């Protein structure tokens, strides 16, 4: 009774360049599609903390450290692109070959982000929802990249990999693990 | 509420499959019995209502050696209690 | 009051039942925390020697439990004008089962007035104890936590044992109706000729609460006396109430009021004309005396000409205007009629854009083009680019010849005349390239064939914009090259290695210095040489270029 | 100092003080200090009179008397000269200031500034109004 999340492996992260990928949602509903840091805990839902930059799935808003309304909501069976320019640290969202604007009439979706240890693509699927994730290993399967993205000098993510990229998700089966010593609430004392 | 310190104990027998409890020495009616090829992890479950909660006190009585003799093959003939740094508490 | 109360014979069964039920559960509710029994009611053993009902104990357990309750029954017989009882009630005893008698239509305040008669009478006595203040509604969320143990205790002498003394801002809207009731007199007490200040502190307050957007038309009920008494005070508040989406009978009368001067309008009037302005805003306010505006069709046809058409914004003769525009395209004062044709444009279909193509012919050598382009692209959807390729590009070619004529004059007093002469195209192009921009947001997917100089027209203008438009920037009463950026995408549909080296001689005419892994990028590119790159190189060369202490007392002396 | 008062008010303050001098020795009591101030026009509260005499037997003379209203005349004009400052600055006298003239009117203002400091005091305030200019000028 929760929400799943999906990401690539930690090795595929980027520090520079100019990257782009697509996402074709099957049904409308509850999605979260964006980018994320590597050190991402799976407990919190996506975009709540300061560890991810992500879009809505239902009502058309951007999600990082809270919320702010942004762009047009979902029809069923559409493509939500995701863009990032490391040369000036900006996050750009497209939708069906159209850039989503803000309430203040700004072109970017996020601005002046710190690089840190870089980013890697991310997604999230709510209860009952479904949507597949093209990523760029076949250039022929790029729907709106020639419309927006190719002329700006962007690159698809898996531009030349001889095999498709590994992915990791969060599973719900609770395991056991030692207590972190920098925990908020509890502690232990081995006197 | 309380005004004293309740101490519960525990006793398992490794060559019979007996599994029993105590409560301040006054034993309880219930016990347990298990198949021989079974691994057991000593566990608690708690909801906290105070600044301090619980302490795993490992020790011994006059005829029974502690849990240190069970985990480590070099400690089978050692009745002293020991907390080596591999013994941690999970969550 | 309870001190001078009427102590009847029926204030004896209810006083002893409001005291015992307040003292029965005193022995059981504390037994979970070891309510002991000893020589004293102390807290060391947590003992309770007062754990006894006030009715079953001796006389000493009632002077502070029943005498405060009989005085409360002297207060519950004095809180309201209903002093009667008609029923009976409802160690370690317990109180009566009275948790179902909650705040009813009459037992809400009657179970709280006995609290106030136990609080405010004793709090005035507490004020008589301080020198010799937990209020009712001014007790906050933390003060009501200390004000609810005795109010529920005073809820047992109001609804239990038959001791029954029983008896958002629409009121501000009713006060607004009272303000409208005051407006019936205040618009009459100066007609035939302290409270005016009450009307003063309201016109801004009306504007405020509307921005925080059962009885929805109660505010619309107030929207009545203003429009009648008028035709700048609360007129802005009326306009503030206009966006806040029976009385429409005055509209035809106002149309008759417009028709009252429309006879000699071919060759006061302030209250009349200003009425229609807020009405027109109210007209498209529900855009989420039926055909009484047929006078409006003949209003501008009679003789503030286009200003009359500005109010007009709320069928088979369109074909009759199709040549009339064309004759005007062959050619004046039908733009307001075109605005009156724009007032009911797209109700839901191909040559509607030909009206603009007709308008372009007049604008090919050309007035108030602000409103002429304002309601223009409201349905710019329907191709016509082939005529548009010859249209505005020639207008650009006229504009390209215009600034070149200006620069040739600037290639040598008298230059101040040319510095004001450049505002002709500045008002023109800002009125021109705007509806055309929305047309570009339709062919972008389509053209992904004849935009080969359509992009270059902007860049030549942008290079002309690159002082040379300082008398164009002041025509704001930045779209100068924003559309060129929007059209820059399709301009990149033309292995650019030399173009990367071209950006040097264009920042040093590069018709001489430019005269002399990548498979995935060139994958879809394969799926008339030298100047097929130098033009595009000059575009980004300017586009990237577009992106490109005093002491203390001396400042106390220069002041 | 005693330069902010020009001469004619002290030419009025003398006989206004001397008439209520009780003995002709140039002294007054503490209570008549308010009564002369009623004749001046400036009528402060009772609270504005102890701190006068707290700043200085109960014997007040024309030496000490000038220092009172000199403290009470500068404060009534030091916060007021920012109003009378801007009256020759702009064109019509409203509040909008063209920044073109301010790049060269400050180089002949009489305080003998240079072109360097006046560029240090223009962008920290195209057109800056009257009230943000003085906010970085009066410090």
Curated annotation (Swiss-Prot), chain A:
Domains: entry comment: The calcium release channel activity resides in the C-terminal region while the remaining part of the protein constitutes the 'foot' structure spanning the junctional gap between the sarcoplasmic reticulum (SR) and the T-tubule. Pore opening is mediated via the cytoplasmic calcium-binding domains that mediate a small rotation of the channel-forming transmembrane regions that then leads to channel opening.
Modification after translation: The N-terminus is blocked.
Subcellular location: Sarcoplasmic reticulum membrane
Record's protein name: Ryanodine receptor 1
Gene it is expressed from: RYR1
Domain B30.2/SPRY span(s) in chain numbering: 1-140
Protein family according to the UniProt entry: Belongs to the ryanodine receptor (TC 1.A.3.1) family. RYR1 subfamily.
UniProt superkingdom: Eukaryota
Remaining remarks: Binding of [3H]ryanodine indicates that the heterozygous channel is activated by Ca(2+) concentrations 4-fold lower than normal. Single-cell analysis of cotransfected cells shows a significantly increased resting cytoplasmic Ca(2+) level and a significantly reduced luminal Ca(2+) level.
Function: Cytosolic calcium-activated calcium channel that mediates the release of Ca(2+) from the sarcoplasmic reticulum into the cytosol and thereby plays a key role in triggering muscle contraction following depolarization of T-tubules. Repeated very high-level exercise increases the open probability of the channel and leads to Ca(2+) leaking into the cytoplasm. Can also mediate the release of Ca(2+) from intracellular stores in neurons, and may thereby promote prolonged Ca(2+) signaling in the brain. Required for normal embryonic development of muscle fibers and skeletal muscle.
Lineage per the UniProt record: Eukaryota, Metazoa, Chordata, Craniata, Vertebrata
Tissue: Detected in skeletal muscle (at protein level). Fast- or slow-twitch skeletal muscle.
From Swiss-Prot, chain B:
Complex and partners: Homotetramer. Can also form heterotetramers with RYR2. Identified in a complex composed of RYR1, PDE4D, PKA, FKBP1A and protein phosphatase 1 (PP1). Repeated very high-level exercise decreases interaction with PDE4D and protein phosphatase 1 (PP1). Interacts with CALM; CALM with bound calcium inhibits the RYR1 channel activity. Interacts with S100A1. Interacts with FKBP1A; this stabilizes the closed conformation of the channel. Interacts with CACNA1S; interaction with CACNA1S is important for activation of the RYR1 channel. Interacts with CACNB1.
Its biological purpose: Cytosolic calcium-activated calcium channel that mediates the release of Ca(2+) from the sarcoplasmic reticulum into the cytosol and thereby plays a key role in triggering muscle contraction following depolarization of T-tubules. Repeated very high-level exercise increases the open probability of the channel and leads to Ca(2+) leaking into the cytoplasm. Can also mediate the release of Ca(2+) from intracellular stores in neurons, and may thereby promote prolonged Ca(2+) signaling in the brain. Required for normal embryonic development of muscle fibers and skeletal muscle.
Lineage top rank: taxon: Eukaryota
Domain statement: The calcium release channel activity resides in the C-terminal region while the remaining part of the protein constitutes the 'foot' structure spanning the junctional gap between the sarcoplasmic reticulum (SR) and the T-tubule. Pore opening is mediated via the cytoplasmic calcium-binding domains that mediate a small rotation of the channel-forming transmembrane regions that then leads to channel opening.
First and last residues shown, out of full length: 1509 to 1599 of 5037
Tissue specificity comment: Detected in skeletal muscle (at protein level). Fast- or slow-twitch skeletal muscle.
From Swiss-Prot, chain D:
Name under which the protein is recorded: Calmodulin-1
Notes on the domains: The N-terminal and C-terminal lobes of CALM bind to the C-terminus of KCNQ1 in a clamp-like conformation. Binding of CALM C-terminus to KCNQ1 is calcium-independent but is essential for assembly of the structure. Binding of CALM N-terminus to KCNQ1 is calcium-dependent and regulates electrophysiological activity of the channel. The C-lobe interacts with KCNN4 channels in a calcium-independent manner, whereas the N-lobe interacts with the S4-S5 linker of KCNN4 in a calcium-dependent manner playing a role as calcium sensor and gating the channel.
Residues where N-acetylalanine is found: 2
Subunit organization: Homotetramer. Interacts with MYO1C, MYO5A and RRAD. Interacts with MYO10. Interacts with CEP97, CCP110, TTN/titin and SRY. Interacts with USP6; the interaction is calcium dependent. Interacts with CDK5RAP2. Interacts with SCN5A. Interacts with RYR1. Interacts with FCHO1. Interacts with MIP in a 1:2 stoichiometry; the interaction with the cytoplasmic domains from two MIP subunits promotes MIP water channel closure. Interacts with ORAI1; this may play a role in the regulation of ORAI1-mediated calcium transport. Interacts with IQCF1. Interacts with SYT7.
Stored PROSITE patterns: EF_HAND_1 (PS00018), EF_HAND_2 (PS50222)
Crosslinked positions (Glycyl lysine isopeptide (Lys-Gly) (interchain with G-Cter in SUMO2)): 22
Regions that span the bilayer: none
Other noteworthy facts: This protein has four functional calcium-binding sites.
Chain sites annotated for binding Ca(2+) 1: 21, 23, 25, 27, 32
Effect of residue 94 to S: In CPVT4; the mutant has significantly reduced calcium affinity compared to wild-type; calmodulin-RYR2 interaction is defective at low intracellular Ca(2+) concentrations and restored at moderate to high Ca(2+) concentrations; increased RYR2 calcium-release channel activity; decreased KCNN2 calcium-activated potassium channel activity; not changed KCNN2 expression; not changed KCNN2 location at membrane
UniProt modified residues of type N6,N6,N6-trimethyllysine: 112
Residues annotated with N6-methyllysine modification: 112
Modification Phosphothreonine, positions: 45, 107
């Amino acid at each position: 009774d929760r929400v799943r999340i999906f990401r690539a492996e930690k090795s595929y992260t980027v520090q520079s360049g100019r990257w782009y990928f697509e996402f074709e949602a099957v049904t409308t509903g509850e999605m979260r599609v964006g980018w994320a840091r590597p050190e991402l805990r799976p407990d919190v839902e996506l975009g709540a903390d300061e560890l991810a930059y992500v879009f809505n799935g239902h009502r058309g808003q951007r999600w990082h450290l809270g919320s702010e309304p942004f762009g047009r909501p979902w029809q069923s069976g559409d493509v939500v692109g995701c863009m990032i320019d490391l040369t000036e640290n900006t996050i750009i969202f497209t939708l069906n070959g159209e850039v989503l604007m803000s309430d203040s009439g700004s072109e970017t979706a996020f601005r002046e982000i710190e690089i840190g240890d870089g980013f890697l693509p991310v997604c999230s699927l709510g209860p009952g929802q479904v949507g597949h994730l093209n990523l760029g290993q076949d250039v022929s399967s790029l729907r709106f990249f020639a419309i927006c993205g190719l002329q700006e000098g962007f690159e698809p993510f898996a531009i030349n990999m001889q095999r498709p990229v590994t992915t990791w998700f969060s599973k719900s089966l609770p395991q056991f693990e030692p207590v972190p010593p920098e925990h908020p609430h509890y502690e232990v004392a081995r006197m | 509420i309380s005004h004293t310190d309740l101490v519960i104990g525990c006793l398992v027998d490794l060559a019979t499959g007996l599994m029993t409890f105590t409560a301040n020495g006054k034993e309880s009616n219930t016990f347990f019995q298990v198949e021989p090829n079974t691994k057991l992890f000593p566990a608690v479950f708690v909801l906290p209502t105070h600044q301090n909660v619980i302490q795993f006190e490992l020790g011994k009585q006059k005829n029974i050696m502690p849990l240190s003799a069970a985990m480590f093959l070099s400690e089978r003939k050692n009745p002293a209690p020991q907390c080596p740094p591999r013994l941690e508490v999970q969550m | 009051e309870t001190l001078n109360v009427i102590i009847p014979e029926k204030l004896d069964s209810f006083i002893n039942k409001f005291a015992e039920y307040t003292h029965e559960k005193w022995a059981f509710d504390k037994i979970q925390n070891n309510w002991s029994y000893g020589e004293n009611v102390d807290e060391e053993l947590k003992t309770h020697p007062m754990l006894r009902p006030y009715k079953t104990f001796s006389e000493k357990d009632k002077e502070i439990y029943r005498w405060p309750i009989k005085e409360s029954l002297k207060a519950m017989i004095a809180w309201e004008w209903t002093i009667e009882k008609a029923r009976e009630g409802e160690y370690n005893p317990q109180p009566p089962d009275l948790s179902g008698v909650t705040l009813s239509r009459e037992l809400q305040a009657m179970a709280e007035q006995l609290a106030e008669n136990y609080h405010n009478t004793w709090g005035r006595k507490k004020k008589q104890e301080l020198e010799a203040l937990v209020p009712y509604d001014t007790l906050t969320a933390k003060e009501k936590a200390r004000d609810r143990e005795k109010a529920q205790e005073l809820l047992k002498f109001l609804q239990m044992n038959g001791y029954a003394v029983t008896r958002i801002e629409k009121r501000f809207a009713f006060g607004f109706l009272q303000q409208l009731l005051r407006w019936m007199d205040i618009s009459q007490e100066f007609i035939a000729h302290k409270f005016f200040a009450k009307i003063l502190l309201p016109l801004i307050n009306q504007y405020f609460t509307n921005h925080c957007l059962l009885g929805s038309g109660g505010h619309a009920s107030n929207k009545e006396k203003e429009m009648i008494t008028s035709l700048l005070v609360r007129h802005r508040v009326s306009l503030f109430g206009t966006d806040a989406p029976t009385t429409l009978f005055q509209h035809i009368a106002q149309h008759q009021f417009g028709d009252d001067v429309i006879l000699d309008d071919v060759q006061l009037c302030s209250i009349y004309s200003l009425g229609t302005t807020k009405n027109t805003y109210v007209e498209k306010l529900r855009p989420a005396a039926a055909a009484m505006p047929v006078a409006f069709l003949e209003p501008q046809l009679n003789e503030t000409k286009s200003p009359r058409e500005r109010a007009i914004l709320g069928v088979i003769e369109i074909t009759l205007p199709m040549l009339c525009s064309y004759l005007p395209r062959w050619w004046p004062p039908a733009l307001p009629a075109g605005a009156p044709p724009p007032c009911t444009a797209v109700t839901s279909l191909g040559n509607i854009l030909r009206i603009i193509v007709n308008n372009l012919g007049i604008d090919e050598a050309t007035v108030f083009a602000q409103p002429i382009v304002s309601r223009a692209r409201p349905e710019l959807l329907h191709i016509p680019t082939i005529g548009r390729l010859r249209k505005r590009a020639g207008k650009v070619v006229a504009e390209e010849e215009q600034l070149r004529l200006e620069a040739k004059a600037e290639a040598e007093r008298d230059e101040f005349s040319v510095l004001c002469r450049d505002l002709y195209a500045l008002y023109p192009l800002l009125i021109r390239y705007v509806d055309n921009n929305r047309a570009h947001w339709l062919t972008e997917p389509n053209a992904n064939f004849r935009m080969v100089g359509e992009i270059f027209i902007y860049w030549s203008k942008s290079h002309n914009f690159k002082q040379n438009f300082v008398v164009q920037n002041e025509i704001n009463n930045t779209l100068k090259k924003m559309l060129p950026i929007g059209l820059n995408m399709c301009a990149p549909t033309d292995m650019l290695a030399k173009t990367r080296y071209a950006l040097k001689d264009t920042d040093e005419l590069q018709n001489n210095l430019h005269l002399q892994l990548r498979w995935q990028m060139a994958l879809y590119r394969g799926l008339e040489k030298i100047v097929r790159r130098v033009q595009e190189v000059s575009a980004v060369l300017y586009h990237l270029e577009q992106t490109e202490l005093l002491s203390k007392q001396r400042r106390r002396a220069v002041v | 100092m005693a330069d902010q008062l020009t001469e004619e008010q002290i030419a009025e303050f003398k006989e206004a003080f001397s008439l209520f001098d009780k003995d002709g020795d140039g002294t007054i009591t503490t209570k008549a200090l308010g009564t002369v101030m009623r004749s001046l026009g400036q009528n402060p509260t009772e609270a504005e009179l102890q701190d006068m005499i707290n700043e200085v037997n109960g014997t007040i003379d024309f030496p000490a008397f000038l220092t009172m209203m000199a403290r009470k005349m500068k404060d009534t004009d030091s916060e007021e000269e920012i109003r009378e400052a801007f009256r020759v600055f702009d064109k019509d006298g409203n509040g909008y200031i063209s920044a073109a003239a301010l790049r060269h009117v400050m180089t002949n203002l009489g305080e003998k500034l240079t072109d360097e400091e006046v560029d240090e005091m223009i962008r920290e305030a195209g057109q800056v109004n009257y009230e943000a200019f003085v906010q970085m000028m009066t410090a």
